[PDB]
Each structure stands twice: as structure tokens, then as C-alpha cells.
Amino acid sequence: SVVANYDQMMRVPIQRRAKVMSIRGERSYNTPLGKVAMKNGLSDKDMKDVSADLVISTVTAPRTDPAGTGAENSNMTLKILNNTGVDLLINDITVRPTVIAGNIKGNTMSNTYFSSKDIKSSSSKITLIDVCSKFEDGAAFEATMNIGFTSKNVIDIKDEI
Amino acid sequence: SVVANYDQMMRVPIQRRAKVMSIRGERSYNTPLGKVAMKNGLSDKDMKDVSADLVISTVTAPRTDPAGTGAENSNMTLKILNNTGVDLLINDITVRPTVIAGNIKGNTMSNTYFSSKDIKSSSSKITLIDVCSKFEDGAAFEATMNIGFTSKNVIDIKDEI
Amino acid sequence: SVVANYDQMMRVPIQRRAKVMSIRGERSYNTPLGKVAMKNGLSDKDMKDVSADLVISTVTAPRTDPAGTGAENSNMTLKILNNTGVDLLINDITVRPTVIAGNIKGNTMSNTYFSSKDIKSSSSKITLIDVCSKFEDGAAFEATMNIGFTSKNVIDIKDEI
């Protein structure tokens, strides 16, 4: 009996402003589990109108902020609408520098926390994922948030008789 | 000809105390490759009695300590009993902050080394994996050790004639 | 309908010298997608002679250097010849400490940027991947560059009638 599953990494362009990290700009592309779209601060109604199988957005006001955080930290609350027809789980998140116009941005160390919640493949449920990252100081900067997605719909092949 | 394999990320709750990192508490849950159980400092006999397909524990006294380490470093020796019936390999380890009771813990930068050993799916062999991490200072703290597991039992599908 | 893909992590032994990171020594082994070989500064002709399905090398003079980098940064330009017959994409890169002869090396924090380019499974095309990492200071050191590879040849199984 053998097992296999699906994994997918997505680069989310972000901006850090003091305590808040947000998605900058808007991205729309296709992938094995369908069309993906991302854009900051969308409503639980707008997300539903977006023409895509997976829409990632955020809570404009990520109010939620862990106790013990300092000026070097920053938060974000991801909003996910999954209509891919596959259960999704985030297995990893990393904030990395970016290179734009031959210029390095987000040239800083980083570590990140993120809640583990199954991202149900429903059509009316918006799943929220809290993300809290630590950086070198409190300066603003642009960077990329790499989100590793894994599917829970595991393939199991057996050799029966 | 196409190939596919299985990957799985597990969050191990840990505690850092000077030079030693240990698993705090005990976790037991089910996953595609079976029931998983984890608990600090178990004997090579106790692990064998544990009712689970994959038991992760540690060497209470992780004696082994790389030369060149300072007060900011910490070690751990993972003990793994794999009865999942699948060859396993750790492809990644990261120490991240945790959020407990709305409180951030392990709010520190981190980098980790870990040995690459195939984790044989035997029933009497306990595989050991050395882990050495670097942190900002020598202060104690709680955090999460994210271990990425990959299977070596790769699925290969060909279209023969 | 379920989906599954293939992922593979490779440890590349590296050396950091000021602004340049290079592969130290030479590695040759077999893996699900074929034999892999790696060695620093190979020509676009030598790589082609190497007896392997996947050859990773570098641009001896990684000239390309992002603006905004300091003494703590370092660059590398990976050269990849993919003859595995599978489209490859790098989903992750991390620089970690190494342990040699019971000695920790590269005991430093780190963050890395890397371009996202599909690595076509052609036979005459050498794909280049820019990598820029940030470290604690400008000191030289040895370490390991963990490159996570994912395949684009996704397996899709449906239950038709």
C-alpha cells in the first residue's frame, strides 16, 4: 500500500507597515487545483463574487494581536475561500526578501507563526488564518510571503487480490 | 511516466532549556500513515509498547553536542519508531514561535541543523536524528518544532503498450 | 477527482566567501527522477557531458548582485540542466548550519531570496536561478543549501462513468 498527496507553494506579495502585514497589488493565475486570486482587504461578499476557485484575502483590520509582541513583530489575518473541491491545509509560511527592478527588498531575518486550521472546501465558509511574524526592527518594507499548501485528499493505492 | 510521493508536516510542541530542547506534554492523533504519538524521554522499551504506528520521542540526555556551539544553541536527539510500513525521511525542521492563550511564545529568530537518515519502517529499530538549533540568546522558552516528513515509497505511473 | 505531485529536497554543500556562495566538492547520487550531480563553476558544455539526468552547477562569476545588499549578503546563480523528463520548479531554499566531524559550521541565522522560474525538462537549455541570502555578518563559512524541488507533472485521478 502506497500513499501520495498534493503540495503547492504560493508567493504572496506583501507589505509590512508597523504591526500590520498586507497583500500588495493583486494576483490572478491558474494552477492544478484551479484559478487562484489574491488581494488585500476584501469583504466576505466580494470574495464570493471573485471569479476563481481559490481566493486569498485579508482582514483589513487584523485586530487580533498576540500578547508579548513588540515593535519588531507584525500580524495578518488571512481570509480563504476554497472552492477547489479539495481540503487544504497550510503546512508552512515564510517571509523572504524580494527582488524588484534589480533591487533587494525585505533584506531582513524572519520567523513566523501561523495557526493550523483545515481549510474546508466549502462555498460559503471563509476560513481565517492568523499569522504573526518577527523581524529585525520596526521599519516598513516589502517582501514575499511563501505559503505552502498541502491537500488532505490523500491518494492511497493498494494491491488487492 | 509520472511520479508522486507523500509529504506530511507535524508540529512538535517543545521547550528550550539552555542546551536542551525537549518535547513538552504528549500528543496522540491519527494521520494517513497511521496513529502518531509523541512524548519526551521514552525508553527503547516504552516506545515499543506505545499503541501507535509512529512514535516520536527523545534521548532524555541528548549528550551529543556539536563543537562550536554557544549559549544561543540547543540540541535534541529525536528517537523514532516507524511502524507505518513506509520508509520515511525528514526533509525539513523549523523552530517557530507559538501562540498560547493569546500569548506569543518563542518570539525569536532561529535556524536549525538536522542529520539526514532514512527512517526505516522496521519494528525493532529506533532511528535517532540529531537536531541542533541556534537562537537569539540563552533564554528558555516554549515553541513549536515543525518536522516535514516525506515518504521514500514513491508512486510511479507509466503508460505502457 | 484527486491530485498528487512529487516533491524532493536536496542538500547542496556550500561555502560562503564574502559576496559569493559556491558549491563545495562534488556530489553524485541516484533519486526517483534519476541520477543527480552537482559541482561548482561548470561550463554550459561540461554540464552537457556529465553523465546524469539532473546536473546542478553555478556561474563561477555570479556577477548579478541586487542593489541594497550589504556585507552580510551573498549571491549565487544556479545553473540547471534537467534531463529527467519532468518539469521542475524550486519551491524553497534555506541555508542551514552543517555538522562536520562533530563540528557545527554555518552557525548563523539566515534568510534567502530565489527567483521562480520553471525548470524545463529540455536537453540543451540551461536554466539559471538567482539566489541571494542574508547572514549575520560578512564572515566566511561552510553550510548547506537545502533546495526543495517540486514537479509540475501533476497526477490527476478521476472516477468517470
Q: What does the DSSP assignment read for A48-116? A: HHSSSSEEEEE-SS-----BT--TTEEEEEEEEEE-SSS-EEEEEEEEE-EEETTEEE--S--EEEE--
User: Which chain B residues have a beta carbon less than 8 Å from that of A7?
Assistant: 7
The closest alpha carbon to C78, from C93, C99, C68, belongs to C93
Report the greatest alpha carbon distance in chain B: 64
Method by which the model was determined:
X-ray
Instruction: Give the whole-angstrom CA distance, residue B79 versus residue B38.
Output: 10
Instruction: Give the whole-angstrom CA distance, residue A97 versus residue B136.
Output: 20
The C-alpha cell at A85 is 473541491
Alpha helices in C8-138 (DSSP H): 46-49
* Residue A120 near residue A86 (C-beta atoms within 8 A): no
Contact status of C136 with chain B (Cβ, < 8 Å): no
Q: Which of residues 23-62 of A touch B (CB under 8 A)?
A: none
Q: Which of residues 77-106 of B touch C (CB under 8 A)?
A: 91-92
Task: State how many domains chain A has.
Answer: 1
Residue B9, domain extent? 1-161
Nearest to C4 among A98, A109, A155 (CB): A155
Which amino acid, one-letter code, is at A21?
M
Instruction: Give the whole-angstrom CA distance, residue A69 versus residue A74.
Output: 8
Q: Are strands C111-114 and C127-134 parallel, antiparallel or unpaired?
A: antiparallel
* Residue C155 near residue C5 (C-beta atoms within 8 A): yes
Residue C87 exposure: Cα atoms within 13 Å on the Cβ side: 7
The closest alpha carbon to A97, from B152, C135, B6, belongs to C135
Q: Are strands B127-134 and B111-114 parallel, antiparallel or unpaired?
A: antiparallel
CATH (domain of B103): 2.60.40.2770
Instruction: Give the whole-angstrom CA distance, residue C113 versus residue A99.
Output: 8
Phi-psi region of A25 (alpha: psi -120 to 50; beta: other; left: phi over 0): left
Contact status of B4 with chain A (Cβ, < 8 Å): yes
Measured CA distances, B148 to B8, B84, B154 (Å): 6, 16, 16
The closest alpha carbon to B156, from C159, C86, C54, belongs to C86
DSSP assigned state of A84: S
Answer yes or no: do B104 and A156 touch at CB < 8 A: no
